[PDB]
Amino acid sequence: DDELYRQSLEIISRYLREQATGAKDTKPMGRSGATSRKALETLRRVGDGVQRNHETAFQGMLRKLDIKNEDDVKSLSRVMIHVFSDGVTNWGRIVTLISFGAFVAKHLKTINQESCIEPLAESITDVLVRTKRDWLVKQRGWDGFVEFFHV
Template sequence: MMKRVDLDHIDDGVSFVRSVAENTFKDGVTNWGRIATLVAFGATLSEHMKGAGRPECVETVANEISSYLAIQKYDWLFNNNGWHGFVNFFHVDDPEVAVRNTLMVFAGLAGLGAGLAFLIR
């Protein structure tokens, strides 16, 4: 997604972020992978904007993504138990696989949490 965006010619409103979010879900399919992808895009974009001397855009990116998810994907998130649903989605009864998946989910959630924290800063 980052390669498709002409980052040198975007305005401070970064309104294109909403278009990216809409395109991510334009086929009507919502899943945890797409949500994580959108958040990761926001974190990567924010990192670029901050490095380009435009840290004021970071909060705007965070607001665009969180508003989109909170409004457009609220029902899906609610029906899928929010972030608890994310953890449960990867649950496996096999103890060996469960330990590995738990570590992967924990690492993923830590990454998402860090991404969201980075977006908010």
């Protein structure tokens, strides 16, 4: 019933799963998929920049998260909510959110827990769309996201 969440999960889920592994999801994309393909391209060009530019902090935070299993995923949500929700809302901070999601997803594919990439995505999507919905609606959602990072 919730269209922006579902779009957002399709974008975020694919960015993370494709980052943790080698290849893209070749499923055809749901409603608003030309924007989702574009937003996904944007997350690849800017997400990788953000990940290489913050590696040491990402390595620190990923290492003190000590993620074993899928039940660890949703105590993780507490530290990410704590770090993401209370300050300034803008597109850079949301892209940093999704890029650390890709970082942790890669780690989880290393420790043979790729089955936890999707719950992670869901949690990230749910945290972004819940606490930021009004902002996302007034900034036009993913079309605004693509236009903001356009080159």
